[PDB]
Each structure stands twice: as C-alpha cells, then as structure tokens.
Paper text:
In contrast, bacteria utilise the FASII system which involves a series of discrete and functionally specific enzymes that produce fatty acids primarily destined for incorporation into membrane lipids. [name] (3-oxoacyl-[name] or β-ketoacyl-[name] reductase) converts β-ketoacyl-[name] to β-hydroxyacyl-[name] in the presence of NADH or NADPH. [name] enzymes belong to the vast superfamily of SDRs that play a broad number of biological roles in eukaryotes, prokaryotes, and archaea, typically sharing 15–30% sequence identity and ‘fingerprint’ motifs. We provide high quality crystal structures for three enzymes: a functional low molecular weight [name], a putative [name] protein, AbSDR, and a HMwFabG.
We report the structure and activity of what we suggest is the primary [name] (ABO11256.2), with preference for NADPH. The model showed two protomers in the crystal asymmetric unit with each protomer consisting of 244 residues arranged as an archetypal Rossmann fold. The secondary structure displayed a central β-sheet (β3-β2-β1-β4-β5-β6-β7) skirted by 9 α-helices. An α7 turn α8 motif forms a capping region, or flexible ‘lid’ to the active site cavity. Overall, from generation of crystal symmetry mates, the tertiary structure is a homotetramer arranged as two anti-parallel dimers, consistent with conventional [name] enzymes, and the elution profile on a size exclusion column (≈ 100 kDa, or 4 × 26 kDa protomers). In [name] this triad is well positioned to accept the hydride ion and includes Ser138, Tyr151 located on the loop region between β5 and α7, and Lys155 located on the α5 helix. Whilst an asparagine residue is commonly observed at this site, our [name] shows a His110 residue in this location, however, it is the kink and the helical backbone that is essential rather than the residue sidechain, and this kink is observed in α4 of our structure. For [name], the presence of a basic residue in the Gly motif (TGASRGIG18) suggested preference for NADPH and categorization into the cP1 subfamily. Interestingly, contrary to previous reports of large conformation changes in [name] upon coenzyme binding (such as that in E. coli), our structure reveals little change at the active site between apo and holo proteins (chain A comparison reveals r.m.s.d = 0.107 Å). Although enzyme assays were conducted in the presence of a substrate mimic, acetoacetyl-CoA, we believe [name] has an ability to bind [name] due to the presence of two conserved [name]-binding residues, Arg129 and Arg172, as these residues have been shown to interact with [name] in other [name] models.
Numbering used by the authors:
A (entry chain A), C (entry chain A): 1 to 244
B (entry chain B), D (entry chain B): 5 to 244
The structure:
Amino acid sequence: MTQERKVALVTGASRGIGAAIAQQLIQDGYFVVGTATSESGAQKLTDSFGEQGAGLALDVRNLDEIEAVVSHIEQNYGPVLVLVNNAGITKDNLLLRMSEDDWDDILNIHLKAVYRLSKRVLKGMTKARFGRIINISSVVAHFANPGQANYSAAKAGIEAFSRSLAKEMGSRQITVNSVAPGFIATEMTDALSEDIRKKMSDQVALNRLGEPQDIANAVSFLASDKAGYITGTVLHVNGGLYMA
Amino acid sequence: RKVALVTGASRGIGAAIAQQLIQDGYFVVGTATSESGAQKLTDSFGEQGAGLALDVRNLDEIEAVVSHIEQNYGPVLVLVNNAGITKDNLLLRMSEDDWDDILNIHLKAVYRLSKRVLKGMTKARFGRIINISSVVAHFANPGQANYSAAKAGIEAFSRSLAKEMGSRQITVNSVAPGFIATEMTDALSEDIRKKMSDQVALNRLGEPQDIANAVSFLASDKAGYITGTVLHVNGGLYMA
Amino acid sequence: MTQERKVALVTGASRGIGAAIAQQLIQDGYFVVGTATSESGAQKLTDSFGEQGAGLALDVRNLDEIEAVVSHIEQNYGPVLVLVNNAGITKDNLLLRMSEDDWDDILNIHLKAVYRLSKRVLKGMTKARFGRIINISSVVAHFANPGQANYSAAKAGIEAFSRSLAKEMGSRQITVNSVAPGFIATEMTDALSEDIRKKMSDQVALNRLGEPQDIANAVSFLASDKAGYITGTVLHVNGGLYMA
Amino acid sequence: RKVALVTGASRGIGAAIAQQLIQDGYFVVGTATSESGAQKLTDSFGEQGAGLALDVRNLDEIEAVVSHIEQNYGPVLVLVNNAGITKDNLLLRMSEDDWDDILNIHLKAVYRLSKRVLKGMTKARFGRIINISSVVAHFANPGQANYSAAKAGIEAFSRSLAKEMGSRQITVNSVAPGFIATEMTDALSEDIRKKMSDQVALNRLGEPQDIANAVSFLASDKAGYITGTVLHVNGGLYMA
C-alpha cells in the first residue's frame, strides 16, 4: 500500500459531469477521490475507480464532514492538489415562493462548500507550490434565469470568490478557475422531451446539447500544465449558447 | 408620497441616498441598527421620512419593519439595500463567522427584503429595487473573498429577480461604487489614498453624493427601461 | 449674436434616438448642434432647434467634413463640450455575403468617426477641464447577432476605444461613456409587423419596446453633473433584454 | 493531415503556435511578411509544413495565399489570426495612419481571412477559427486606443461569426494573452518588468508556449463544444 500519484478530489462524482471529470482525471494520471452524498454511492464510486481512486461519502453542507474527508484523504492517499467542486443541486422557485430553506440550502451546498473546501486544501497546495481549484459554475451565473435566484447568486459568488482566491494564492502557483457548462446532456435532460431538447439545442450555436465529456475535457485542460498561466477565469463550455 | 426604504442610512452612502430620495419626492424610511441611530434618522428626515431600528441579519425584524411601514406610511415601492460592513481576511485567516456574517448582512438581507416587498410592488405594477454592490465584485481584492462573493451574488440575484418581475414594471438594478471617501478612508493619510486615487482614471476618490445621484437616477422615471444592470460609479477604477 | 450656453454636438440627430437626445440636451440647457447627412436634413434640424441650436450637414465618413464642422461650431457657437456620437447605419449580411464595402463603410461610419470626432474635440475639453463624450453603442456589441459582424465589431471597438480614452483623459475631468440601447421603437421597428414586435418585446424583461426618450434620458444623465464620477462604462438601456 | 494556417509565425507567439499545431498533427502553413521569413518558416517546419510570404494588409495577397494552399496542401480547416504589431500613441498624438494601419493588420485581416476560409470549413462541416486578441481589449491601456479597439472588434466579430457558422460545427474563438515575454519586453530591464509582473497574480510574465497551449486546446477535439468565447491567458492580470 503506497500511493504516489497526485491526488485529485472531485465532489459529486456519481454521474454525468462529475463522473466524467473523475474518470478523465484518472486517465490523466491522478489518483482520484470522488465523493457521493450516501455511503452506497461512495461504494459505487470505489468500484468504478478501482485501484486508482476511492469513493467517500460527503454531505458538502457539513463542515465536520468536509474536514474529516480531507483529513482521511491526506492520511491515506496524499495531499489534495486538484480540487474540483462539482457537488450541488438546484431548488428552483420564483422569489415569492422561495423559502428560507430553498435559499440557504443552495447557498450552503454551492458557495459555502466551495469556501470551506478551498480553505481546507490551501495548506497542502501552498506547501507543494502547486494547486488547481476548479469550480463547476453554470451559464445561469451569467445569463440569468427566473426561478434560480439562489443558484445564480451562489454560482456568481463562487466566481467572485475564485477571483479573490486566485489573487491571494497566485504567487504560490495555485490557479483557481471556474468552468461554466451550458446545456449538457444529463439524466435531467434525458428526462425532458425530444421537443424540449430541440428547443434547447435551437438556442445553441453548435445546434446540439453538449456531453459530460466536454466539461471533463475543459477541467482536464485547466488541471494540466497546459493551463499553468490561466487563473481567475471562467471557461465557458456552452456551444455558443452564451458568448462572453 | 411614494415610500422608499433605505437600509443603513445613518451615514455616508446611505445617508446621501436617503436625503437625495427625499429631495426627489419620496417619503424615505431609513434604518439604523441602533434605536439611537433610528431616532437621529427620524430627527434628520423630519416630516418627509421616519427612522426605524433594524438589524438586517434578523428575519423577524425585517418582517416587522416592513409590516410597520405598510401599516403607517404605505407600500414600499423603492427598496435600497445598502450595507457596507467588511470583515476582511485572507482565506487562511477567514473564519466561519467572518464569512457567514458578511453573507448574511449583504446577500441574505437582499433576498429577505426583496422577497418581502414584492407583493406591494406587484400590486402597484411599479417598483425599484436598487442594491448597493461594489467594484470588488468585479475587480477582485485579496482578503475580501466574503465581501466579493456576497456582492457578486447580489448582482446575479438582481438579474434573476429582474426577469421575474419585469412584466410588472418593477426594475431591479445594482449600483457598484468604487473608492468613495468615508470614515475609514479618511483614517489613512495622504500617501495611502494617493495610492488609491492613482488607480482611478478621474484621479480622485468619489463622494457619497455620487452614489446617491446614481441611485436617484435609477429610482426615477428617467430609468424606467433599465433593469437587471450594474451601474458602475468608480471614476474609471474599473471599466466594463 | 452671442452664444453663452455650453455647446453639445449630436451627430445623426434627424430622427428617433438622435432627435430625442438633441431635444433633451436643449431642455437641459445646452446649445445643441445636430448633424444630418444632407443639407435638407440639416435645415430641418435648424428649424426644430430654433434659436437654441443649429443644424449642420455632415457625412461622418469624411475627415475634411468632420474638421470643417467642428471648426464652424467653434467659430460660431463655442467649444464642443458634450459630444454624442449617434450617426451610423447598418449594412447587414452573413459573412459569406459581406463585401469589402459592407465592412469598410460600417467601420468608418461608426468606429473611425468616433475616433476622429473625439480626437477633434479633445483640445477644447482639455482646456475647459470638462468634457462628456457619449457614444451610442448597441446591445449587439454584447449579445452577438448573425449578419452584423461589421456593426458588432465597430460598436465593441468603440467601447474599447472609450475605455482607453477615459483612462487618458480622466485627470482632466473628461468622462467617456457608451449607452447601449436595446429594442427601441424607431421608424425601423414601426416598419416591422405587430407580431414581430411582440416577438421582440417577449424577449424583454419589461415586456415592451423602449422609446427614444429612454436613451435620451440615459444620455442626459451621463452628460450632467450627476454622473461626474462615471467614466469608461457602458450604460445598458434595453429593458432587461441583456443583463450585464 | 488537416491544414492549419497561422499568420505571423516567424517568432514568439506565432512560432510557438505553429510548432505546437505541428506537434498536434496539423500540416501548418505559417506566414511571414518577408520572403526571407517565409523561407525560414519552410526550413523550420520541414516536411510537416510550408512557409509563405503574406502582407495581411493586402486582400490580393490573402486570396492568392489561400488559393495556393488549397491548390497544393488542402482546405484551410484551422485558421489562427495572429498579429502583434503596435503603433501606440495617446489620442492627441495618434495619426490617421497609426489608427488605420493597426485596424487593417488586425481586424480587417481577421475579416478577410475568416471570410476566405469559410467555404472549405463549411464543406467539411469542421472548422477552427482562433483569433489572437489581447488583455488590452478588456483592461484599457493609455496610448493603445487603436490596438484595443481592433482586438475588441475581433472578439465581437468572432461572436457574430460563431453564431453564423455554429450549425456547421465550425467554432470561432479568441485567445487573449496578457504580459508575455517577448523581444520588446526583454528590452526593458529588471525593475520595469517587475513593475509588469507585480500586476500579475501568478507574479510572472507568461511565455509564448502558454498561448500555444491555449490555441492547441481550442483547435483540438477537446474543445468541440466551445465557441464564441475569449480564453484569457494572463496569469490573473485581468480576471473575467
């Protein structure tokens, strides 16, 4: 039992974008720790990653669990040198119907979790004089959508936090970036109808929904030496749905 | 007169906003966190306003204050969310309390107050929600991750709400001040604020009245086709 | 014959947005020189402005005419202390069908004209330690539209030029800003059908087309002392059609 | 192999781009304005490329070069518009020639070359147009109004063209370098580029290979769902 590869931590790795990111980072040569909210899901991740990764249960809303998970990774696999913040649900509602819990839960799962996990991995990245924090944002952080004020506020806050952290950590060669997916094919889009997914792809310049692997490719690029002079940016992967 | 609610109106930007909105013809309820401050606000606004105590961190107080305003003065049709509290620290030294308090005072308060005033604005088919953001939401500053995240969240929240409320002719906008002359800015002496003003194209720190002018514009009929935007008032410190 | 009011120059003042801007600046207390491309149009402007303005013919594509017009204003009315660059047409075409003239004419009418006129009025603004350059951009400089690559490139170039000039002239208290109209009711939108203008207003958060006076209000604000700490910005007046 | 055309490939950013695209598997035609430079490009690329002389200001030369490439090597399916010529001056001192030459070398050339390669990309239902912009298109620099306007125009042009060509699976993107180590940057000595690198979060000037890496990414299958964007490569000098 000796683990010599650099360690990547991917939260919310069970399916879709998170699963593709985790598998791509494995292919890139990392030892990947993926997280799921349940222990069953964590075991499914352990099974998928085999001897080049591990699955751990983590509710990113809880600081005690964040600290325990990162401590476990450091004590068993090594310092987290790539952090991909992908965990996170939506709780949509127009503001008149958006409850205190609807707001707080989303802000905690997305923005607070990014703050907590980034803070927790900073010591190891600083010691290594190498680090990658890659936050999965969304196109709705830029192109606002009614009913997603909580999600949009959280994602935009994550982007601003990333800029501040990039400035604080730049001299230690830690890059902090966000990837903003557009319409990507997920179980959720699979749930939608043919006609709705044509409505969606009609809004995309490339005239199709993206795939999880497109986001994985963007993250793999940002985590590599090929993006060592890129920090504090948003990398939009939306097929021209939103251009900035 | 139409009722405007301005939080944190005791001094600086908030006070200038309240006085300007009074001049524009609104009945201005300004808030302070202390009852002493609320009484001084009552005294300053006189017959064209009222002062109320409000800790914007507390939902019960928000609901009570808005209910009181509705019961005595009228529907809140202009809401200006003005908070300027900082708890700076580099992330290594930024505690959970430092993060949470800033997020609550700024972003959560914007959520709570905006939600609470929606009914009256919807009924009137008229509304102005004006959120005080900051240049730091765009031009990042080391040690202000919490403040930057909160202000950027406020801007994104404003865009979403603007889409939700637009058809009722309610506009939701943010004003982003740059370096404005204040208590703490006055505390540093000549070379330090020369360091600051050297970054400003207009080569000077702004004044609270500049932000009040932007808020007055957005709250007026002159800006009825402007919604979901950020109005930068920073002398060229940061340029779209 | 003595002219004591501050002089504003509004190019393309014959109708719609330009006409509303010119009339509002008159109401604000300026002596307004408006331009039209023909001498007939210039005479119609002279008639509309009466004793508080003048109409002059100007093809903004031509440097000799720019220099002659500004010299005439300085010699008869006073230094141009407010410049509103509004002259400018569209020549739409998908790139495969966009000719050299289609490109050059639009770039010259919009971007080159802004460069030439701003350069020409800088001396007077510098001497006065007061100045307002206000450029009418467009929402399509931000939300790109197929078939308008020339117009979009010109408007975005104008915005970048404005940022550079704002930095160069800031210490002399000259502000340089752009106003970006969205769907505003013009003869061109009047030409469109009821159903198309509902398609358009359906995209606007405020659920209606704007009016020239909305743009005039934005320009009047920027030209006043109420916006003396605003420079190098874009003021979007699009009813929520585009949010940034 | 697929044919990529890289303008201004003789040195620095352009040379790094050309070499990297060769490594990625493209047949790279690089251009220089002199025939001497074109021959040196031919020598450097050897069996995996060709060097051609091109003054990007001249439409006839653009059409001749692209026709030659089509007649000998194949359809241009990757176009990298790389120009880095400056003619700085504050507006008071910026002549008509200084403005026009920069606009022509940068923006007009992007228009002309992009237009000329559209037919082959459309036929192949594959394409990469990658335009070298600059941080100055976003963070304004006194004395560079012409360069800033041209680069920003290039970015807007790219967005419009991306919408026009997207359904044919042609992506159009810009790469915006920050402070990259070059001839002229090397000319200034330690304290001057320390002044520069102090503005960079990563606390150093970039290298041509960083821009080549970004262009290689965008030109690859790894970026097939990225279009109409600006990829900032500036070490945190300017942050979206």
